[PDB]
Design a protein around this ligand. Sequence first.
Ligand SMILES: OC[C@H]1O[C@@H](O[C@H]2[C@H](O)[C@@H](O)[C@@H](O)O[C@@H]2CO)[C@H](O)[C@@H](O)[C@H]1O
Ligand SMILES: OC[C@H]1O[C@@H](O[C@H]2[C@H](O)[C@@H](O)[C@@H](O)O[C@@H]2CO)[C@H](O)[C@@H](O)[C@H]1O
Ligand SMILES: OC[C@H]1O[C@@H](O[C@H]2[C@H](O)[C@@H](O)[C@@H](O)O[C@@H]2CO)[C@H](O)[C@@H](O)[C@H]1O
Ligand SMILES: OC[C@H]1O[C@@H](O[C@H]2[C@H](O)[C@@H](O)[C@@H](O)O[C@@H]2CO)[C@H](O)[C@@H](O)[C@H]1O
Ligand SMILES: [Ca+2]
Ligand SMILES: [Ca+2]
Ligand SMILES: [Ca+2]
Ligand SMILES: [Ca+2]
Ligand SMILES: [Mn+2]
Ligand SMILES: [Mn+2]
Ligand SMILES: [Mn+2]
Ligand SMILES: [Mn+2]
Lengths: 232, 232, 232, 232
Amino acid sequence: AETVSFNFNSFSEGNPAINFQGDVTVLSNGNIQLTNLNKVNSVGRVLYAMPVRIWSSATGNVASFLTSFSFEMKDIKDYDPADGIIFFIAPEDTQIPAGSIGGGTLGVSDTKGAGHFVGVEFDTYSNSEYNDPPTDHVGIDVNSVDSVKTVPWNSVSGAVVKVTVIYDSSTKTLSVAVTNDNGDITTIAQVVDLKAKLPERVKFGFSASGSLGGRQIHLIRSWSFTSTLITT
Amino acid sequence: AETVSFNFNSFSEGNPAINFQGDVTVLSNGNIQLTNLNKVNSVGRVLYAMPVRIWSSATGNVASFLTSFSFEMKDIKDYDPADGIIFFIAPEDTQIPAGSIGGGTLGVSDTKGAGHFVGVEFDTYSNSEYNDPPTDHVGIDVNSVDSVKTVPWNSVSGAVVKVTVIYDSSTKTLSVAVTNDNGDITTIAQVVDLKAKLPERVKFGFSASGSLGGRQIHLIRSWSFTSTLITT
Amino acid sequence: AETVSFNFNSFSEGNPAINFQGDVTVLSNGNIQLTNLNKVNSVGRVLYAMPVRIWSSATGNVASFLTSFSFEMKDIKDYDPADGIIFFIAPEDTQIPAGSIGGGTLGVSDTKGAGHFVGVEFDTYSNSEYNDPPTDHVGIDVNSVDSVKTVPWNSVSGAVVKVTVIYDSSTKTLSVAVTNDNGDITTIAQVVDLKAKLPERVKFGFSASGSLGGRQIHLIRSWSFTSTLITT
Amino acid sequence: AETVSFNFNSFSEGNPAINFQGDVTVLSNGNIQLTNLNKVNSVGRVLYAMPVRIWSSATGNVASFLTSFSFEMKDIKDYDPADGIIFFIAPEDTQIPAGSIGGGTLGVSDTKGAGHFVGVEFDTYSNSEYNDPPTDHVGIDVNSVDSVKTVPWNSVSGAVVKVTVIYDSSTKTLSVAVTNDNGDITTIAQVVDLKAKLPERVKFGFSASGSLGGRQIHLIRSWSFTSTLITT
Ligand SMILES: OC[C@H]1O[C@@H](O[C@H]2[C@H](O)[C@@H](O)[C@@H](O)O[C@@H]2CO)[C@H](O)[C@@H](O)[C@H]1O
Ligand SMILES: OC[C@H]1O[C@@H](O[C@H]2[C@H](O)[C@@H](O)[C@@H](O)O[C@@H]2CO)[C@H](O)[C@@H](O)[C@H]1O
Ligand SMILES: OC[C@H]1O[C@@H](O[C@H]2[C@H](O)[C@@H](O)[C@@H](O)O[C@@H]2CO)[C@H](O)[C@@H](O)[C@H]1O
Ligand SMILES: OC[C@H]1O[C@@H](O[C@H]2[C@H](O)[C@@H](O)[C@@H](O)O[C@@H]2CO)[C@H](O)[C@@H](O)[C@H]1O
Ligand SMILES: [Ca+2]
Ligand SMILES: [Ca+2]
Ligand SMILES: [Ca+2]
Ligand SMILES: [Ca+2]
Ligand SMILES: [Mn+2]
Ligand SMILES: [Mn+2]
Ligand SMILES: [Mn+2]
Ligand SMILES: [Mn+2]
């Protein structure tokens, strides 16, 4: 069958395999820093350049994928740690929304919180305008930052977090596993019909954002991905 | 929260953290060989010594767990490569069925293919008495080797296989991601209520078996596990 | 390497990973309260249920281990705050000494003060019968509550204490760093050959005690542990 | 009792509490990058500005200390991952050796491998000129990179390592506990007279180096320290 798979142990600006959008910047240690600590309403996104085919309109089949990545979020002096990082899937021509206000939109939606994407968010600030839970959380988003489902989580400054995501095409189930710093794990699952929400070709990536007063360090340390679409 | 996690890069007889049942043998390279090549109807199981509490009768909560392990099956000169490996969850007092015929019972069920366990199998021989699909396969078994659900899969002799499992207590969804040697991934998910099928305290482990004519090498190379139960 | 590791940010009765002996009791705040304030000569002990293999008779190797925990001792109205907490290591068959008088024996030794254990004690009452120093103290005990070595210390009521213990198998050196409420650190080191004083398999734990007129609150707030044995 | 204690969760150039020497550099994520990947024979060092009094010529007492820190080392394309990082203690007037060839001297010793310092090195390259073990290692150095004692160790690219150090004035013992990423811990201890090797007031710091063909990322993520000297 059709299989797309890669593995980044460190990133490097200049690699044609990765699209850099917004305030993204590659540190000299291989980490990807998504936002700019000095800019207002900063929004940075990194995408895997090669578009992936998650479903064929010919066979009707949808792809199954396995992906895991590690990130870090650290507080900075005199700024509210906001708003988070989001692993998303969007049309192959996706771009930071025009006139993006950063903040609660996480760099993937308009002001209303709407957008054309699907993804797992690690939200560290509660936005009432988007019906955010009263605590840090992990949520499954489907064309909106108004999560379909969320689970309480805790973001620890300077802590490296590992995430594993499995998407089963048969059950159309997206299940996430978050391994916090102290060993504890957080999981959240949701049935999402990728074929009905996204186009045949999509791009996977990360996105982070901030506001005027909400800012923090968003880092992607590593990321491996494998998808398999049955072509028959 | 209540977290239980362990990581095995290699095994060594003598470790109080591991129970050996049956024809289990520890190779000098640190790998565990589950069955005996010179015995008829051989059965070998290896369990995590300590029982794990997957759910509380007090709070009614179920634990979530993330676990990944790698195994290897290799053909030997004249036996049909059978019968396969199985990752299971069973009562803390779990033993190799009395008078086990090994073979297609995978060392966890009786002759009718019934038993008290929940598990993911890597069945390599088609047993029609247990309604096995015509090809090798991965299946989710619930108190029976007559899988509740299966997916076509291929066992490549001498190939190292990586498996990742996620159990989201919330949705009670068990998702499995198999990474074949050629990079292709196979996934399968199924909703199982561990709280309704298993007792509060259970044990996790692996089991493998063979017949008189069906024999092959079953190797468990590594295994890390983490489970978290919300206690409140 | 054979590694055993665990981490407790909170405890909860029912966890198969923990063994309770004596007047132990888990508070709703997740804390462990070792003794019973209404019993005479009360003795409470908590142990990690799984036996750790500190040395191998095959290789002659001994394991190194790093562990840290925090406890709290708080005075109660008409009893002398006595007599302390001891972090011990004992044979896996360890039990509270028959006919234990509690008190200065800290729940690990007989009346003479003898026992089969190794431990770091935090003594809050001076027992001339066990050659206790005139002040509160931290001591390294080897098969007796008549410490091999002690160092002055000061138990502050209601104060949270953090302790870190390192055991280097090479030098057979056991070093302890106690961090008091006011920031100051107290340390004490001692060479203890664990392979000569204890059997291959042991259990780790905490014990506290009191007498008729000597009572106080003994709390265990957290406990993280890790040991690695070189298997080769 | 005279206590000194600081705790850095992140570092930022411009902070008067920390001295910088060589090619040090503070990344936008708060990390300290000791070496420059584009320079030959690069040496970078970072010290706590305020000198700490470890012993007293008046009382004769020697301070005990507890200090833990976490670092990360990662491989860069087309370069041998060398030579390592070393947590050292030196005279308050300490400076990078004149005409420092970086490389195996780790930026603390001259070509012969001699210098006026005491430290724990995490060596990733085997320099035969300094009698290095054939593999990666941790070693206790006393005025020389020809470690008084060393222990096998393994540096994992991109992995965050946690170190804990304890110095017991009484026994003059310096024990080190290194927690690897896979959970495994490595320990090493040695008796060292800080009073006979160093002056009354010293400076604590970190140092890293590289050569022409040997380069890698040396990152210091966090550092907490507490030393107490009995003033009587
Ligand atoms: O505290 C972080 C949140 O900021 C919100 O925006 C604030 C902004 O930070 C503040 O400087 C001022 O302009 O008021 C704004 C409106 O509340 C974001 O909307 C929110 O998403 C957080 O980032
Ligand atoms: O071919 C492997 C399968 O063998 C089945 O049992 C065989 C047995 O191996 C053979 O010697 C003879 O007795 O016929 C039996 C019936 O097929 C097992 O039942 C099956 O699980 C495979 O191992
Ligand atoms: O006061 C604390 C100490 O009490 C000692 O026992 C006392 C006992 O409490 C008292 O009722 C009377 O019987 O005298 C005993 C001997 O002094 C314990 O032995 C000692 O360990 C402290 O707990
Ligand atoms: O592989 C790194 C080691 O390099 C040694 O120096 C090399 C140098 O890198 C190379 O360019 C050439 O000059 O040969 C030298 C001698 O081997 C360092 O001495 C050693 O410490 C490592 O850094
Ligand atoms: Ca938000
Ligand atoms: Ca079968
Ligand atoms: Ca006493
Ligand atoms: Ca070297
Ligand atoms: Mn949200
Ligand atoms: Mn089957
Ligand atoms: Mn004592
Ligand atoms: Mn060395």
